[PDB]
Every structure is written in structure tokens, then in C-alpha cells.
């Protein structure tokens, strides 16, 4: 069972595609992906100033 520990001051969004329901959680907790849940892959700017 794939599970990711969420950082203290951060958040993560997932969607249970099989059941048709979204959910979002924040704080120092661990998200446990259901059989058809998937993380929201968020490509952000970084590098040196901003890429």
C-alpha cells in the first residue's frame, strides 16, 4: 500500500477515481492511496531564481 508522509506545513490532493470522489489533506499526516487513488503531480517553478 503506497503511502506518503505529508510535511508539517504542507498539503496534498488525491482523487479516488473508482469511487468518483476527491479529497485534500494537510498537516504532518500520512496519506494512504486507495487502489485507484493518485497524487496531484504539481510541476512548480524552481532552479535558481525561477524556471
Amino acid at each position: 500500500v503506497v503511502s506518503y508522509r505529508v510535511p508539517h506545513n504542507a498539503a496534498v490532493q488525491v482523487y479516488d477515481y473508482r469511487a468518483k470522489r476527491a479529497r485534500v489533506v494537510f498537516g504532518p499526516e500520512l496519506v494512504t492511496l486507495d487502489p485507484e487513488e493518485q497524487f496531484t503531480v504539481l510541476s512548480l517553478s524552481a532552479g535558481r531564481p525561477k524556471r
Binding site: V1, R18, T32, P35
Partner: protein, 51 residues
């Protein structure tokens, strides 16, 4: 097919064949695996205690 478990002693009866030795799955707090009920194809995720 069927499964036999528990602290006992089995022997191949004159009608049946052994397929495999069901073992190797220990889970603890916030841990688990994905299992698919082959008869119905119901993919699910069991977590918590050993299963």
C-alpha cells in the same frame, strides 16, 4: 479452490492437491497491501493488522 490455516497438522487427502503455502504478509500501524478478489475482480486495500 480453498485455504486451510490455523495451528494444526494437515495431510494431502486421497482427493485433493496442494497448490501453494499461504504466508509472508505481516502488517502494522499505517501499513498494508492491495488484494484482488479474483472471482469478482474487486480490487481493494486492506491495512492495519496482519492479514
Amino acid at each position: 479452490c480453498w485455504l486451510i490455516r490455523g495451528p494444526l497438522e494437515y495431510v494431502p487427502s486421497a482427493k485433493v492437491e496442494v497448490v501453494e503455502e499461504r504466508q509472508a504478509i505481516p502488517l502494522d500501524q499505517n501499513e498494508g497491501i492491495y488484494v484482488q478478489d479474483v472471482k469478482t475482480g474487486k480490487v481493494r486495500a486492506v491495512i492495519g493488522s496482519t492479514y
